[PDB]
């Protein structure tokens, strides 16, 4: 069974068997987390596991609303979006529950990446090495992360489509396949329809396909024709204009041998560049670069048309930076395999010039080093082929150096090499015991909110929670996973981190002015608030918000809920930082002392962050420095508001909070202690003239304005 020769085999039957083996491997491998997570009651809702990224709930809401057939005007529902639409088709066609579909779609489609990997490897007559490369590429660390079961997001096809476009270019370079004239464009359309940001990659790849053609095929008409078709496919023409052009030029080139004169096709290239230009061309690329590569704060380019706001970019986990070890493991699950993968890619390049067309994705992935870990994805499959090529290279050496190796033994050697180098990805999967977005309890709290509040109501929360609340509670939010600029975040920051009188004034004013801005398009909503109540600056208006005798000339059009969950505690300083920023200034106002940590054991308490709590319960020890406490607040009931305020030092400024119900400690300053969050959630102290308590739980509180 093993003595036979697999390397030379490139048959369609063999490649189909290999695709099936690798696809089944990819699915099976992302089934372990389902097996693990299913044993915890905390992860279920409606008899199924929950989604596993915040953003999935955005498409999940959208899918739900397409199924229901409507949404409300100006909830920012992903109604009609691509992943919502594919979810809706599959839901209407299949017998499985909605939650199961949303759980498993990524597990299926991300595994399709196995197809183009080993078909590209096969175009070079390396199908078996393609098979190994597809195994590695399908479960490599960062790719797995954003496509595991429950990662119900757009990442699940975001390399499959570009890899199929690459395969398309390869087949054109090797066989001059006329069917490329059709597939290259169609795939770009699908990619552009599935992930509009894909524009940038498409623009780069198409661009390179031109330069490559100016070099290696400077005379072949089919390359110029397919370039014109692809640039058209990049444009904003209606789908029928695009497809009409594509099919027209395709038939005319396919069935005419007198064909299309060369001047005509250069004319087509010009018409194309004009059309794509009218469609906005290259601007989306410079914008995305502006946000991720240049990390600008004011990205909409409004000097004095807006106020100045804290920059959310340095706040999102996806966009956080990464050191070289982690970059390499994200890409290859291991430094060794990464080095060998890179060598393999060089050798593959300096053997198949066409693999040059993979450079955009490679470049995009490496761009992670500047633009955040979320980009390494783009380098996984390219680099995986590189590793495949390295293996082909290695055994090639072993024959060009006449090494005496049986077939059975060379095959045992290959299986061993591939298994030993694919191990790190499996380890990562095993350890990547990710958990649900929320707990059953929070999804339950928000669904009960659904049955309590109205569809046209707002809940003020932090933007992290915008998608899950809108999914579970079917309400409106101020900010969410895709609407979370400084200018957007300011209102929720203020409501949650300032005192209650102005927090409620701001909750009413912000919800009302957001609703108005749907009809009025304020470039800055805070600026609209200011320039309505006849104030001179942001600080001026916000400080005028402090008056218990405040006139409210904006009428009430809905209820305004405030969602205050326990899990926000640990990011309270980050939330607070947004309203800590003088909008007239961009300047930080107070210093913000905060951290939450767990006691270790039970004589001097140490806490995770090295902060020693005094035996006295009267001082802390940060970085060798002992700092006095103003008070030790020992909180036994978050819901009852039963707590014990122990005075220590009227002259000091730091508070220590003990959460018995969580066995956790909080270290904060005076400014944060009085925030709406710490008071209404932890201590259960709220002005009953300003809010009504709607839900009171140890894990979350929901209040309503009045």
């Amino acid at each position: 069974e093993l003595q036979q020769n697999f390397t030379d085999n490139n048959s369609i039957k063999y490649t189909a068997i290999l695709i099936l083996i690798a696809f089944a491997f990819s699915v099976l491998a992302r089934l372990y987390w389902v097996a693990w997570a299913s044993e915890f009651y905390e992860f279920f809702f409606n008899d199924q596991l929950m989604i596993t990224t915040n953003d999935g709930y955005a498409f999940a809401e959208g899918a739900r609303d397409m199924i229901a057939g409507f949404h409300q005007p100006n909830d920012l529902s992903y109604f009609g979006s691509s992943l919502s639409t594919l979810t809706y088709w599959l839901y209407s066609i299949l017998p499985f529950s909605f939650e199961s579909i949303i759980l498993y779609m990524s597990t299926f489609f991300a595994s399709l990446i196995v197809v183009p990997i080993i078909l590209i490897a096969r175009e070079y007559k390396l199908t078996t090495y393609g098979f190994i490369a597809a195994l590695l590429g399908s479960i490599a660390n960062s790719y797995y992360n954003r496509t595991m079961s429950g990662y119900y997001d757009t990442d699940m096809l975001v390399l499959v489509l570009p890899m199929l476009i690459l395969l398309t270019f390869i087949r054109l370079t090797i066989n001059k396949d006329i069917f490329t004239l059709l597939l290259s464009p169609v795939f770009i359309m699908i990619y552009l329809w599935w992930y509009p940001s894909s524009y940038s990659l498409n623009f780069a790849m198409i661009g390179l396909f031109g330069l490559y053609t100016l070099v290696f095929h400077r005379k072949e008409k089919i390359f110029y024709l397919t370039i014109a078709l692809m640039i058209i496919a990049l444009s904003m023409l209606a789908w029928q204009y695009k497809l009409a052009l594509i099919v027209l030029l395709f038939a005319i080139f396919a069935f005419k041998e007198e064909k299309i004169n060369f001047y005509m096709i250069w004319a087509l290239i010009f018409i194309s560049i004009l059309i794509l230009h009218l469609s906005g061309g290259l601007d989306p690329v410079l914008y995305q670069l502006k946000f991720y590569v240049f990390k600008a704060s004011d990205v909409q380019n409004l000097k004095d048309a807006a106020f100045m706001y804290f920059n959310v970019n340095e706040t999102i986990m996806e966009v956080n930076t990464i050191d070289p070890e982690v970059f390499m493991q994200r890409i290859s699950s291991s430094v060794l395999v990464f080095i060998l993968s890179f060598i393999g890619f060089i050798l593959l390049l300096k053997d198949h010039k066409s693999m040059l067309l993979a450079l955009p994705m490679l470049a995009l992935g490496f761009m992670a080093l500047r633009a955040g870990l979320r980009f390494t994805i783009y380098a996984v499959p390219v680099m995986a082929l590189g590793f495949g090529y390295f293996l082909y290279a290695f055994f090639n050496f072993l024959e060009k150096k006449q090494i005496k190796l049986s077939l059975r033994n060379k095959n045992i050697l290959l299986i061993l090499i591939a298994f030993f180098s694919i191990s790190p990805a499996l380890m990562h999967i095993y350890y990547y015991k990710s958990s649900t977005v929320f707990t059953s309890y929070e999804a339950s709290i928000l669904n009960d909110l659904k049955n309590k509040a109205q569809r046209e109501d707002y809940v003020v929360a932090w933007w992290d929670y915008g998608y899950p609340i809108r999914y579970y509670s079917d309400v409106k939010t101020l900010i969410d996973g895709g609407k979370h600029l400084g200018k957007d975040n300011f209102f929720s920051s203020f409501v949650l981190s300032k005192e209650q009188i102005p927090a409620a004034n701001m909750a009413r004013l912000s919800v009302e002015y957001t609703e108005k801005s749907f009809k009025e398009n304020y470039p800055d909503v805070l600026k609209a608030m200011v320039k309505d109540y006849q104030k001179t600056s942001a600080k001026d208006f916000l400080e005028s918000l402090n008056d218990p005798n405040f006139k409210i000339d904006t009428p009430k059009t809905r209820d305004v809920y405030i969602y205050m969950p326990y899990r926000m505690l640990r990011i309270m300083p980050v939330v607070a930082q947004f309203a800590n920023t003088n909008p007239d200034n961009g300047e930080q106002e107070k210093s913000l002392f905060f951290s939450q940590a767990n006691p270790l054991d039970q004589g001097s308490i140490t806490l995770d962050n090295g902060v020693e709590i005094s035996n006295d319960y009267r001082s802390l020890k940060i970085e060798g420095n002992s700092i006095p406490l103003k008070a030790f607040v020992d909180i036994e009931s978050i819901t009852n508001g039963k707590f014990y305020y122990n005075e220590i030092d009227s002259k000091a400024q730091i508070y220590l909070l003990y959460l018995r119900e969580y066995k956790s400690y909080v270290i904060l300053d005076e400014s944060l202690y009085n925030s709406s969050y710490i008071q209404m959630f932890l201590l259960n102290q709220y002005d009953q003239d300003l809010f009504e308590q709607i839900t009171n739980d140890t894990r979350a509180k929901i209040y309503r304005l009045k």
Partner: peptide, 8 residues
């Protein structure tokens, strides 16, 4: 790691 959520 790969979440469109807050950290810090």
């Amino acid at each position: 790691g790969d979440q469109a959520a807050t950290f810090g």
